[PDB]
Each structure stands twice: as C-alpha cells, then as structure tokens.
Design an enzyme around this catalytic site. Structure first.
Site, PDB file in Angstrom:
ATOM      1  N   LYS B   9       0.857  -1.165   0.000  1.00 44.70           N
ATOM      2  CA  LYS B   9       0.000   0.000   0.000  1.00 44.70           C
ATOM      3  C   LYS B   9       0.884   1.201   0.000  1.00 44.70           C
ATOM      4  N   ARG B  59      -0.356 -15.259   3.958  1.00 44.34           N
ATOM      5  CA  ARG B  59      -0.816 -14.523   5.145  1.00 44.34           C
ATOM      6  C   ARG B  59       0.142 -14.696   6.322  1.00 44.34           C
ATOM      7  NH1 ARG B  59      -5.672 -11.623   5.032  1.00 44.34           N
ATOM      8  NH2 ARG B  59      -6.454 -11.442   7.168  1.00 44.34           N
ATOM      9  N   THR B  65      -2.664  -9.178  10.937  1.00 43.35           N
ATOM     10  CA  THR B  65      -3.253  -7.931  10.419  1.00 43.35           C
ATOM     11  C   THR B  65      -3.051  -6.791  11.363  1.00 43.35           C
ATOM     12  OG1 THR B  65      -5.156  -9.471  10.437  1.00 43.35           O
ATOM     13  CG2 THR B  65      -5.213  -7.633   8.838  1.00 43.35           C
ATOM     14  N   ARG B  76       4.826  -7.719   8.603  1.00 38.57           N
ATOM     15  CA  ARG B  76       4.258  -6.739   9.550  1.00 38.57           C
ATOM     16  C   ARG B  76       5.025  -6.675  10.850  1.00 38.57           C
ATOM     17  NH1 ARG B  76      -1.273  -9.010   7.622  1.00 38.57           N
ATOM     18  NH2 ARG B  76      -1.770  -7.562   5.918  1.00 38.57           N
ATOM     19  N   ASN B  86       0.167  -0.216   8.549  1.00 33.16           N
ATOM     20  CA  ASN B  86       0.437  -1.631   8.285  1.00 33.16           C
ATOM     21  C   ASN B  86       0.903  -1.818   6.841  1.00 33.16           C
ATOM     22  OD1 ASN B  86      -0.462  -4.156   6.869  1.00 33.16           O
ATOM     23  ND2 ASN B  86      -2.566  -3.466   7.280  1.00 33.16           N
ATOM     24  N   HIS B  89      -1.548  -6.091   2.048  1.00 33.89           N
ATOM     25  CA  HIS B  89      -2.772  -6.827   2.114  1.00 33.89           C
ATOM     26  C   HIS B  89      -2.540  -8.111   1.407  1.00 33.89           C
ATOM     27  CE1 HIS B  89      -6.888  -8.091   1.465  1.00 33.89           C
ATOM     28  NE2 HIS B  89      -6.444  -8.431   0.269  1.00 33.89           N
TER      29      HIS B  89
END
Lengths: 112, 112, 112, 112, 112, 112
Positions: B9, B59, B65, B76, B86, B89
């Site tokens: 992002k 993931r 998350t 992360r 963060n 995705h």
C-alpha cells in the site's frame, strides 16, 4: 529527477531476483515510478526508477554487461553466470531511457 | 498451484519495501505470476503468487493484520508501526483471492 | 511518540551486534533519538528510540527475556544462547523507560 | 556443550540453502563441529553443532516439522513449501542426537 | 591496533543507516571502541574503530568520497545518491584520525 | 561445467563464515558438488563448486588475495583483516583445481 528503465529478463525471473534488483535500487535512494511484469519470450519485469543521476547510477548497480567482468557487489557480480544468463538490462543514456520508458510504458502507468 | 493476491500500500511504497515483500515470497518458493504498480490514493503494487498452499502461506509471511500482534520474522512484524501504517494486504481465502486476482488483473497479465 | 530505552550488554558487544539491534529498530520505523556507548562492567551501548508504541514494540523486537523461549526472528531468538548470555535489555513499560532514559542520558543528549 | 545433528535434504540442497542453515546456526552462537555432504537418494548435508542447549536450540531455528505450522523467522517458516518439501532434519533429543551423530559421522570427523 | 574516526551525517541519519555502517565495520573485524550520537546541524553519529589497518580499511568500506564514483559493495556505493547526500565521513590518515578522535571524544569515552 | 576448489581456513572458521562463503557461491549460480570439514592445523572446510567459468568466477567472489587490496562486495573485502587472517583459498586455474579437488577429495565424495 532523471529516470531510467530497468528490466529483469526470463532466467533472472526463473531464479527469483527482481526482489533483489528492486531492493538494491530502493536502498540506493531511487523512487520506483513504474513497474509491471509482462508475459510472453519468457516473462519479464519492467521498471522505471527516478533520481539524481539514476541512469549512470542504475548501470553501476547492475555491474558490467559482460558478467565475466562484473564485480561482486553489483547485481551481475553477485548473481549472473554468463552473458546470455546475465538477465538484466538498464538504459545506457538519458536519451535511450526515454525511448525505453515511452516504448514499454503507457504514460498513465508512470507517476509524474 | 493455488494463487493469491498481495498488495503493498502507499506508505509501504513510500518506505521502499515491495522489494522486501517480493524477496520473502520468492524465498519461500512461490512463483510470481503477475505484478504491476498502479497510480492514484497513493500508488500501490499488486502481485499474484502461486504455490501449494499459498493463500495461507502468504498470510503467514505477512504476519497478523493487527501490527501490534505481529511477530518479528513476518513482514508486519519487521516493518509495520500501526494498523493504518500496516500497509500490506493479502487474500484471506482461496475464494477471495479469485475475486481480488480477477478484479485487479486482466487475464492477459497473469501467466497460466 | 513514546520513547524507550534499549541497551546492548557486554557479551553482545563482544559478539558485534549493536549494528543488528539498531538495524532492526530502524527497519521497524522507530527514530533513534539518542545513543552512546559507555565504558567500564564490560562496555555497553545505550540507545533511546521513539515511535508509536515503541515500548511494547521494542520488547517484541528483542524477543522473550528467557532466550530458551525466544523465537527466531527476534534478536534473542536469532542471537542469544543463554539467559546470562542474553545480552540486551529493553524497558518493560512507558514508566520504566523514563526512569531508564533519564538515569542513563543527560537531556542535552536526547533530541526532543 | 551438548551436540546435535542437522541435515539438509535433497530439494533443500537443489534450492541452495545449506548456506542459510549454517549461517543461522553460526549467528545463534553454536560451534560447527563436523560437516560433510554425502552423495546418493539425492545428496545431503550432515552437520553437527555444539552449544548450551543446542538440541532444543536447533529445533527452534528449524521451526515446526509441519511447514504448514512453521512461522517466519525459522528455516521452515522462511523457506519450506510442503512437509515433503520441508527438506531439513534436526535431532529431537540429546539421546537421538548421539545415535544420529555416531551413525552418520566417523569420530575422526568430529572435533572433541 | 590503529584507530579511526567515522561519522554518519544528518541525511544518512534521516535515512536510517548507522546500523548498516556499524554492521559493515563489525563484519570486517574491527572493534568499536567508542560511539555516540550528537544533537544540533542535523544530528550525527560519531564512532571510533580499532584494528590492523583500519584507517585505510575504513575508507575502503565507505567507498570513494565522490558517490558518482563509488562502487556497489561499499557504503557510498550501496546507499549514497549525491556528494552532498553522501552523508558519511572517515579519517583519511592515521594522523587525521587522532585529531578527529581527540576532538570529538573525551578520552573517558574511548576504551584503551 | 568446470569445477574449482575452495577452502575456508581456521580463523575464518573461528569467526563463523563458511555459511557466508557457501551463500555467495550459491547465490552466484554455482552447484556445490562436494564439501566437508577436516580436523587438525585448525579445522578447515573444503568445498568443490561447479559451473560455467567457476574458477575465475570463484576467485572473483573471494576478492584479491592481498586483503589490503580487496574491495567490499567480495569475501575478502567484506570479512578479512590481514593477509594471514585472510582465511580462504580458491584454485587459481582449471589445472590447479584438479590437483586440489583430486588431492583433498575421494571421488566417491564428488558428484559427477
């Protein structure tokens, strides 16, 4: 704020090292201003980087074209076994970058 | 041979770590089967990776998350300061991957 | 904008890994706001880092106090053989940080 | 001064990561006290490491046996796609190490 | 057992790479014998390293002063975009080190 | 498909960097075709690597014999303090490799 075009070629891509390439240009301070992967020959990854002196800068990160002369510390030094299996390309001048940028990328894809 | 969708992002991209993200998925054994960067908000980098169990796999590379719960060793964990910041995705199921893959990518762009 | 105190202890320092420690806190997004090395016992390296949630953040980068329970990916996971030879300390609360910051550092040395 | 036996299996070896494995055990503080590669099935790399608590230590560096449960930061976390393609083995106890050490290595090869 | 003075300058420090610098000198075998950060212009990190031939050694780790000539593998090669934004300094002789060491550091701070 | 002989010498081995050496040759694309550690003087690690141009290739990864001339990016550049404490050896020709391979390794140990 020049810009240059870099591309990681099929074998490079089969070995798994556009991450490496991107990490080195990031680390060196250049902004990544476009990037995409293209499918067939062999798939390739096209990128455009921007920064003070990035065309000469980028060629130096890549190392000498002839992997037999490429020193460790450069991409070709660290990764490439033969000139065929060199698998990387960067623009050789500010002039040739623009031809390569504007050929390979729609301008919507670049980032001003 | 499942596939999943990953995206890095804006802030992530301002910090300079899609290289990192790509390197971790490469290192883990997944094939990168599409990738491109998209311009505005903030620019983002979309990718698709393919491999045995890559959706759960991906993931796990990303970590929890909620960056306050993300352990070191994950993206992360290692990189992200707050849930807003963060900046990453990944698909949460094989079902949602297909929606994300097929929304964000023309099929010409993917690689069979 | 909390702050925390981290210190790398003698053996840690004989092994050569305050670089590592600093790199992980940098990578995680925290600003280094003070740092110095102190001579005797054994020399030690004191640091102060600042960021959203950095006290809990910092302890997580370090891993569990008891190196026998420390997971890979953390400093103690990756580097420390025994609880004595753990050789690292981080504040356990926002309260204890301030005692540690203000004890070990003249305020001229910190950076607002 | 316990000792443990670690081995990197064929696919692991086809991927090129006994370096990685050795680097992590070095980094963690363990002495490498024997090592050799063995030819066929598939070639394999046998090692013996020595240190305070190295048997439990070593299994933790490797991560959970079932790569679907292995966290990032461990070898299996970072590298292994499936339980078959896990490609790594470490002793599960001080007892089993000795059977594995003494089976796979002539004592001339170990280092007291 | 010579000694040299190294310093990481503001932008360097805003980018987050005294860790990197310290890691390279550690990795090369030099003992870090003093270090501290100093506040304003821009903050800076002063260090002193000790080892066989460390003054010439240290300049080589840093790479050529003119970042346009600095090769990959060195700090300036890998990290610095322009001579202003070079952001690093090392002593150029055993003589100048002593002036720099003794100017910037109280002797209590050094480590014999 | 030439082959070359590389060896990591005692101090090198006391410092913990045959991992590093192996990682660089792996990364460069060479197949490791034999390897073992040998006990006394000081222990040493013998290896054989195979690839297009690997003898000249390998010497380049190692850097100049005289560590005072070795550039960063090479093993001797990054790691070695003095010519004694250089601690690494690679074959200087295709001819000398064969003498070194065939002296140090039983052929059962090599891998065709």
């Amino acid at each position: 704020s020049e810009r240059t075009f870099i591309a990681v070629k099929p074998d490079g891509v089969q070995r798994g090292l556009a991450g490496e390439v991107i990490c080195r240009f990031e680390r060196k301070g250049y902004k990544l201003v476009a990037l995409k992967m293209l499918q067939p020959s062999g798939p390739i990854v096209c990128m455009v980087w921007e920064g003070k002196n990035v065309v000469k800068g980028g060629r130096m990160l890549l190392g000498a074209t002839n992997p037999a002369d490429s020193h460790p510390g450069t991409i070709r030094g660290d990764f490439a076994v033969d000139m065929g299996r060199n698998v990387c390309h960067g623009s050789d001048s500010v002039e040739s970058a623009e031809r390569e940028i504007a050929f390979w990328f729609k301008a919507d894809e670049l980032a001003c």
